[PDB]
Amino acid sequence: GTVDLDAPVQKDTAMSLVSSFENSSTDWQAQYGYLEDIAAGRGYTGGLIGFTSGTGDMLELVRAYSASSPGNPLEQYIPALEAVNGTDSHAGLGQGFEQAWADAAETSEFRAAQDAERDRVYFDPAVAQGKADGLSALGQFAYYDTLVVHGPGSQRDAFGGIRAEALSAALPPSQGGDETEYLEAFFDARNVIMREEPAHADTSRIDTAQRVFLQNGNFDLERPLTWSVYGDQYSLN
């Protein structure tokens, strides 16, 4: 490879790939207002990368939004988000919270808060670890999508654990290993974890997208790209 995932065109391409996986649309800027309980046990899932009320990151996002934009319509729901954190309960939230999310998503400031939380927790750590492992943009993207779905952490079902399992099977480029063999190992490790949860059992984001880019040798993740997820085809010129 020759460019990292954080280059401006590659980053935009990354956001469109993840929106195709999360919302079945390459129009990633239409997804800041997404808010749904997809009934997989995480409560509400919201925004560009599926921040959730069950796992702490929706809370972190709304707190940061409230620091940067006092009095916004989500701030009053901070106590409820604190209370349901760690559970999939909607208690204290409901239609008023769903409407306040919709309202906040029309503003620059909420969109900026989502961008910041995405970059601090998920995207910039994927890029930094990819580069430390000697990976191309496509490798960096493999790490980013893993962080989006599985989150950070060293547990076997989080990004750090998936990466540890890959490293046990294949050396990364930074240690002399071949990138293709490393990413095939990484995708194999990730698919094991995906298949352990019924909501993640469909691995097409890997098998008919990421693996395709690797097969094509598209290490810089350059356009034009074509891929499928959930049996639907997508293209980015």
Ligand X SMILES: N[C@@H]1[C@@H](O)[C@H](O[C@@H]2O[C@H](CO)[C@@H](O)[C@H](O)[C@H]2N)[C@@H](CO)O[C@H]1O
Ligand Y SMILES: N[C@@H]1[C@@H](O)[C@H](O[C@@H]2O[C@H](CO)[C@@H](O[C@@H]3O[C@H](CO)[C@@H](O)[C@H](O)[C@H]3N)[C@H](O)[C@H]2N)[C@@H](CO)O[C@H]1O
Question: What's the min distance (Å) between Cβ of 51 and ligand X?
Answer: 5
Q: What is the 3-state secondary structure (H, E, C) of 181-232?
A: HHHHHHHHHHHHHHCCCHHHCCCHHHHHHHHHHHHCCCCCCCCCEEEEECCE
Task: Tell me which DSSP letter residue 170 carries.
Answer: S
Q: Which does 151 bind (CB under 5 to 8 A by kind): ligand X, ligand Y, none?
A: ligand X
Question: What's the min distance (Å) between Cβ of 171 and ligand Y?
Answer: 31
User: Judged by CB, which is closer to ligand X: 143, or 219?
Assistant: 143
Q: Which tokens go with 227?
A: 């891929």
Interface with ligand Y: number of residues (CB under 6 A): 10
Return the amino acid letter for 229: V
Question: What's the min distance (Å) between Cβ of 32 and ligand Y?
Answer: 14
Quick check: 41 and 34 in contact, CB under 8 A? no
Between CA 144 and CA 175 the distance in angstroms is 21
Q: Which tokens go with 109?
A: 């400031």
Task: Candidates 1, 43, 47, 50: give the one binding ligand Y (CB under 6 A).
Answer: 50
Per CB under 6 A, 232 contacts ligand Y: yes
Task: Tell me which DSSP letter residue 52 carries.
Answer: E
Per CB under 6 A, 155 contacts ligand Y: no
Q: Which does 56 bind (CB under 5 to 8 A by kind): ligand Y, ligand X, none?
A: ligand X
Give residues 195-214 in contact with ligand Y (rule: CB under 6 A): 199-200
Q: Which does 134 bind (CB under 5 to 8 A by kind): ligand Y, ligand X, none?
A: none
User: Judged by CB, which is closer to ligand X: 40, or 171?
Assistant: 40
User: Judged by CB, which is closer to ligand Y: 136, or 146?
Assistant: 146
What are the phi and psi torsion angles at 81 (to 5°)?
-65, -40
Q: Which does 55 bind (CB under 5 to 8 A by kind): ligand Y, ligand X, none?
A: ligand X
Q: Which does 31 bind (CB under 5 to 8 A by kind): ligand Y, ligand X, none?
A: none
Site map 8..27 versus ligand Y, x via CB under 6 A? --------------xxx---
Residues that bind ligand X (CB under 6 A): 42, 50-52, 55-57, 121, 150-153, 158
Strand partners, 234: 227
Quick check: 225 and 213 in contact, CB under 8 A? yes
Per CB under 6 A, 45 contacts ligand Y: yes
Residues in Cβ contact with 104 at an 8 Å cutoff, skipping those fewer than 6 apart = 65, 72, 73, 74, 110
Position of tokens 């707190």?
63
Q: Which residues of this chain interact with ligand Y, rule CB under 6 A?
A: 22-24, 38, 45, 50, 199-200, 230, 232
